[PDB]
Nucleic acid binder design. Structure first.
Ligand SMILES: [Mg+2]
Lengths: 102, 621, 587
RNA sequence: AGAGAAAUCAAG
RNA sequence: UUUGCU
């Protein structure tokens, strides 16, 4: 699967790289930039995700924590870890048997 | 007949009087698996009390009267045949432990008891992950791993698999006609049974001769190899232009320019210069793409394949002969040493501007410090500038090869200094390409600003004189045909910085370990085999020369270089062994120098490496 | 070259990493492969007898010969039947637990193999459409053909698919209806399509002066090949003399750590095998497998199943290709073998249409693990009291003897045993150091107690092209795998991170003055993620963490932006979080 | 013309 | 197809 590796630079620089489902939330033209294409899943330019990070419908904080909980656990584990100085160079069967005898 | 070490003695003795194992096929294995089941039940039942009484009650290997009494106490009844192994009071559910070769084959069976299915590898059915706890599963998995280890160690895999699962069936067969087809090109049948006594004979071998001295590589004779790389190397230069976009810089270049041919090459006729300015103008007026012109025909070999076809056909009177190819031998050219000297020339700006990572641990700090010191060492060198030029040119040219195009495309080579001033290294014009495959060679017309011109070094380049703001420059035009894959590879030519970085870091860390303290600001003397006046150099200069040589090798990488290095690693190891007063021995009829000499034909860098090898001593005492 | 020979601070072994030019483009084969394919096919026949007699050897079905015909001076192409039997028996005895694990795999794991994985293969040549196709498509059409011609439904198990192939091999005529055409095969035609191997240039192969081809089998016989290769892998992973396919770290370090009483002669022989794939006989491999299975108490049908693919390969038909190039003074014409005199005229009798029928020798990339097993069985002899590690072609042996004469006798015995099983170690590429402590194997260079692992291919430090978050995660994972594998220390690890970060930022128009940066500057959209332009947050000790979680823990991302970019309702959309940046490209 | 090395691209 | 990786 080397083709995506070589095609990325051209793919991103295309006029309408991102393929997205049609939506009304994203403005057709924001401050002179034509974000979406009206022809079908429609297409949008790479600035749409950047636009969303500034003007987008926020989901509940509880949703955010749930999605990030798995990775936040690893982050917390690492930052709570302590790194040392850097160097250069039979009874189970007994209980069952006794219980059966009882 | 003994007790397996992973089964407790009490369980073994108890099972001894539970069934007539002697009259059962594979009685020992049957008893062993039943003991495994009992031990699994015990592992489930251990240390689990519900309301002061055990949470799990074991009916396995208990008298029917007591089992029925217990079940009646719980207001449940089970048949003699379908007697569950365990009963969980907390869940008030009966369970029957089961062992199966594969968990997927297991089925719920009847509804009298939930089936706790497990495999010999310790894994449990997806349902078991609910009913049983994590500790129970871990203990059972460990015990069953030990049991499987015992099974494999005693060659009882088949017997156990039969006991737990059933009996294997004929899952494959071949008819007579397929057997006939198979037995067409071999002296044996489908199951080869050559009736010959197995025995290894004693053949008469040869003697292993010692390599007392290292071999000498073969230096080829012939014309000096010319510069055959895509772009220029040490002879790369750029025109400084006012800050702005690529179009503005190209317009500034085009406004004040008197391009006149100084040295015409018969391979790239001077007239092709018209194909450059026309593009330079076209890029200035917005559009980089441009319609063809008359000169373009000879610039990008337009309608040339058919021309050669017709010319060869018109003069092909003869008879066919096997196509024999010959690689023209060439000697070591004198410009390799000059290129190496010039590539490590100091610059003003640092040409390796990479962002730092986020230091969190002391290890991260040490790594970032090492990388920063390496960048300082090799940042201010001409080789870094040429690497940046190559990367930018390759990226800009490869970004235009993803679509079929019948018009001339212009891909300039411009890099911006930290002050914002543009730097025009040259331009690459992409002829009409209709790539249907990947490795197809697209046609390029490459114009490059050159500091100094040598006919013997650039026979196929056409050198013109450029004039900007009074300053004079040389501009070399080359008609090339380059593959897409090579362009993509050079688009990230920055990877050449890793090997010298590895060597520098290894030296620094070795010093630190010897002193137990990391002193980054250290450069020891690396003793080497040099011309003779000097017996070594500091670490920084050595790293710079390594970077220059690695860049040259990468730019001149090809089958000859690949083979030469692959077969030279052996001789490098042999030299290292000889240095340590070891002895190197070889089989009969061995000549590694032959495998190396096979790959010394044209490459100038390979010839440089071979000469360097020859310069070194070949005998150690 | 003297610049790569430091004799003060580090050793030439440490600078073995400098003898790689993999940062440059890999050579690509050009034009017809017929010359290389024919050379590969003809090499076995020349080496069968001490004096090349290709015509006499072309009539030999099984490549078995007596020890007299084994060439102890040049490459040998045959094998000794009795020696193979005894060596296989010795290997079975010495590694009995490995054979028991193989038996467990056969009894438990083999029957439950699904042929869906058969869709993970290389570009397959359709015997219906007559052209190379992706593996899933070829598998789909082959299964459909089997269903049509068998009037039954093939079970999901691999054994069921192989049995279906064996059954359809019993029909005098087979038909395939596909939209709408009806392709008809006779038994002989389908046999030819099943046994035909398709040759292809091994593009992007390093360390070789001359390009070499590889062979791929038809989708009909790929199930048996998969079964045999999986069995070989299972037996190999439990054998301490194998360097593949599992990590070579432990393999090479374990022998490097071993020492002696400073009184025995210790030697280290590093070597490769000359024309490794052009000397092995499939008959030897199937005989070794038969010995293994029989001594393991396996049933007859298992032995037949294991043997079938080797017989089919023994009756193979190699695809010649476009043809040999002939000139007419200055013209050029590719013509098939047999139309005019050439170097391979001896093989003209074996031409079958555009395919050449050969019995001896093998092609690369088909039976790698079985070939390694065959090489390994030959080392289990009384004389060879030394450690051995082999990866297909490369090998390293450690001798621990009482005198130099014993060491040389053992080395020659190793060479002669490899000849016995049909493997010739390249004399020019085999070097023995005494005392031991310096060696090379599988691109790992060992000196005393330091094993420098040198990558055979520097990682492509660029985004994979999926999307920013996935690309960043994958690149950091690659760098970490290279680092902990030993191919990159801390300094070069950080440098590789910086290079990948620069390339990744460039690929998404986040570095200079682009449309993305212009948009984010006009609208005052601060860059908070690496792909947007923010300073990198990962480090040497934090390549395994996700960017979003790591930034959130550091306060670089706020709850408002976090809820904006992680909102599942965003109209845009590996351990990366599914944020708004996990988009997909159009084409 | 050119790239290149065992023979392909230099359109289809 | 509009062009900014030291
Ligand atoms: Mg080797």
């Amino acid at each position: 699967d080397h083709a995506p590796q070589m095609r990325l630079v051209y793919s991103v620089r295309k006029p309408w790289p991102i393929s997205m489902t049609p939506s009304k939330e994203i403005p057709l033209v924001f401050n002179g930039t034509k974000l979406k294409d009206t022809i079908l899943r429609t297409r949008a330019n790479i600035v749409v995700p950047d636009y969303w990070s500034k003007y987008g419908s926020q989901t509940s904080l509880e949703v955010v924590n749930a999605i990030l909980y798995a990775e936040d656990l690893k982050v917390q584990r690492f930052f709570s870890t302590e790194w040392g100085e850097i160097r250069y160079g039979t009874d189970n069967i007994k209980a069952t048997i006794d219980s059966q005898r009882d | 007949t003994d007790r397996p070490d992973h089964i407790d003695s009490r369980v073994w003795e108890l099972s001894e009087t539970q069934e007539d194992w002697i009259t059962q096929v594979h009685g020992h294995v049957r008893r062993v698996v039943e003991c495994w089941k009992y031990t699994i039940c015990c592992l489930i039942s251990n240390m689990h009390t519900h309301r002061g009484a055990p949470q799990y009650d074991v009916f396995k290997w208990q008298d029917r009267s007591t089992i029925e009494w217990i079940c009646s106490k719980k207001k449940v009844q089970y048949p003699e045949r379908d007697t569950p192994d365990l009963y969980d009071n907390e869940r008030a559910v009966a369970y029957k432990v089961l062992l199966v070769s594969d968990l997927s084959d297991h089925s719920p069976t009847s509804g009298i008891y939930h089936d706790l299915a497990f495999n010999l590898e310790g894994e449990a059915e997806e349902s078991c992950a609910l009913v049983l706890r994590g500790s129970q599963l871990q203990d059972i998995k460990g015990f069953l791993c030990r049991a499987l280890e015992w099974v494999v160690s005693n060659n009882l895999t088949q017997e156990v698999v039969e006991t737990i699962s059933g009996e294997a069936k004929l899952q494959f067969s071949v008819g007579t006609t397929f057997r006939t087809l198979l037995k067409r090109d071999t002296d044996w049948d489908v199951i080869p049974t050559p009736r010959v006594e197995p025995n290894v004979p004693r053949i008469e071998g040869r003697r292993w001769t010692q390599m007392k001295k290292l071999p000498l590589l073969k230096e080829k004779e012939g014309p000096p190899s010319p510069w055959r790389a895509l772009l220029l190397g040490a002879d790369s230069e750029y025109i400084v232009c006012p800050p702005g976009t690529d179009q503005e810089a190209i317009s500034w270049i085009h406004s004040q320019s008197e391009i006149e041919c100084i040295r015409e090459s018969k391979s790239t006729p001077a007239s092709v210069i018209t194909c450059l300015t026309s593009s330079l103008q076209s890029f200035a007026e917005g559009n980089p793409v441009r319609s063809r012109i008359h000169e373009d025909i000879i610039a990008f070999g337009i309608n040339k394949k058919q021309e050669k076809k017709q010319s060869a056909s018109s003069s092909a009177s003869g008879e066919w002969k096997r196509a024999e190819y010959q690689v023209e031998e060439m000697s070591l050219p004198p410009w390799v040493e000059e290129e190496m000297v010039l590539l490590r020339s100091d610059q003003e700006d640092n040409w390796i501007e990479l962002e730092k990572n986020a230091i969190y641990t002391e290890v991260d700090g040490v790594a970032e410090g090492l990388v920063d010191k390496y960048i300082e060492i090799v940042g201010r060198t001409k080789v870094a500038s040429v690497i940046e030029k190559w990367q930018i040119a390759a990226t800009r040219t490869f970004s235009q090869l993803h679509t079929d195009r019948s018009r001339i495309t212009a891909c300039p080579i411009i890099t911006r200094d930290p002050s914002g001033n543009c730097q025009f290294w040259g331009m690459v014009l992409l002829g009409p390409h209709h790539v249907k495959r990947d490795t197809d060679n697209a046609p390029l017309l490459i114009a490059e600003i050159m500091g100094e011109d040598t006919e013997e070094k650039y026979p196929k380049h056409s050198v013109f004189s450029l004039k900007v703001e009074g300053k004079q420059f040389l501009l070399s035009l080359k008609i090339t045909s380059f593959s897409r894959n090579k362009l993509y590879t050079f688009s990230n030519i920055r990877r050449v910085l890793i090997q010298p970085a590895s060597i520098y870091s290894q030296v620094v860390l070795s010093r630190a370990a010897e002193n137990n303290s990391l002193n980054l600001e250290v450069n020891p003397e690396i003793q080497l085999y040099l011309e003779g006046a000097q017996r070594g150099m500091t670490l920084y200069q050595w790293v710079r020369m390594i970077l220059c040589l690695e860049f040259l090798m990468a730019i001149y990488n090809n089958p000859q270089m690949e083979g030469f290095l692959a077969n030279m690693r052996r001789l490098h190891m042999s030299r290292h062994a000889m240095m340590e007063r070891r002895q190197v021995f070889l089989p009969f009829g061995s000549r590694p120098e032959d495998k190396v000499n096979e790959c010394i034909i044209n490459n100038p860098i390979v010839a440089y490496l071979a000469k360097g090898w020859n310069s070194m001593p070949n005998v150690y005492y | 070259m003297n610049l790569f020979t430091p004799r003060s601070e580090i050793n030439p072994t440490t600078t073995q990493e400098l003898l790689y030019a993999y940062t440059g483009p890999a050579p690509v084969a050009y034009g017809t492969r017929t010359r290389a394919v024919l050379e590969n096919i003809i090499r076995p026949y020349q080496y069968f007898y001490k004096e090349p007699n290709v015509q006499r050897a072309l009539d030999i079905k099984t490549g078995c010969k007596e020890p007299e015909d084994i060439n102890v001076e040049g490459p040998s192409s045959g094998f000794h039947t009795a020696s193979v039997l005894k060596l296989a028996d010795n290997f079975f005895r010495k590694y009995r637990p490995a054979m028991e694990k193989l038996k467990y795999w056969i009894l438990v794991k083999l029957p439950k193999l699904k042929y869906a994985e058969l869709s993970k293969g290389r570009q397959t040549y359709s015997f219906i459409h007559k052209r190379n196709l992706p593996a899933p498509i070829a598998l789909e059409e082959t299964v459909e053909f089997l269903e049509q011609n068998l009037r039954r439904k093939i079970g999901p198990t691999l054994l069921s698919y192989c049995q279906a192939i064996a059954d359809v091999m019993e029909l005098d005529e087979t038909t395939y209806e596909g939209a709408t055409y009806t392709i008809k095969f006779s038994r002989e035609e389908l046999w030819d399509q099943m046994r035909t191997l398709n040759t292809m240039w091994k593009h992007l192969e390093r360390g070789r002066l001359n390009r070499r081809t590889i062979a791929t089998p038809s989708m009909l016989i790929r199930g048996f090949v998969k079964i045999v290769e999986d069995a070989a892998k299972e037996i190999l992973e439990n054998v301490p003399t194998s360097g593949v396919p599992v990590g070579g770290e432990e393999k090479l370090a374990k022998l490097a750590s071993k020492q002696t009483f400073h009184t025995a002669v210790t030697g280290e022989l590093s070597g490769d095998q000359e024309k490794f794939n052009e000397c092995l006989d499939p008959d030897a491999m199937r005989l070794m497998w038969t010995v293994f299975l029989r001594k393991l108490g396996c049933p007859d049908w298992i032995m037949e199943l294991f043997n079938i693919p080797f017989m089919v390969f023994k009756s193979k038909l190699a695809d010649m290709g476009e043809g040999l190039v002939y000139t007419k003074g200055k013209l050029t014409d590719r013509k098939p073998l047999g139309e005019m005199p050439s170097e391979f005229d001896d093989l003209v009798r074996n031409v079958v249409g555009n395919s050449i029928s050969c019995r001896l020798g093998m092609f690369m990339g088909m039976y790698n693990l079985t070939s390694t097993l065959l090489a390994l069985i030959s080392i289990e002899r009384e004389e060879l009291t030394g450690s051995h590690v082999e990866s297909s072609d490369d090998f390293i042996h450690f001798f621990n003897c009482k005198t130099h004469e014993e060491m040389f006798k053992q080395a020659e015995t190793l060479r002669l045993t490899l000849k016995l099983v049909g493997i010739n170690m390249s004399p020019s590429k085999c070097i023995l150091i005494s005392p031991a402590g310096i060696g090379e194997f599988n691109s790992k260079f060992h000196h005393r107690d330091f094993v420098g692992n040198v990558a055979t291919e520097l990682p492509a430090l660029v985004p994979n092209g999926t999307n920013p978050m996935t690309d960043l995660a994958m690149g950091l994972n690659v760098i970490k795998h290279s680092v902990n594998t030993g191919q990159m220390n801390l300094c070069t690890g950080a440098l590789a991170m910086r290079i990948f970060n620069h390339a990744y930022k460039y690929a998404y128009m986040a570095l200079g003055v682009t449309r993305r940066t212009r948009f984010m500057e006009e609208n005052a959209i601060t860059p908070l993620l690496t792909n947007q332009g923010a300073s990198p947050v990962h480090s040497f000790s934090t390549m395994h963490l996700d960017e979003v979680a790591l930034r959130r823990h550091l306060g670089l991302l706020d709850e408002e932006t976090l809820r904006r970019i992680l909102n599942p309702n965003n109209p845009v959309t590996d351990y990366s979080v599914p944020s708004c940046f996990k988009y997909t490209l159009s084409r």
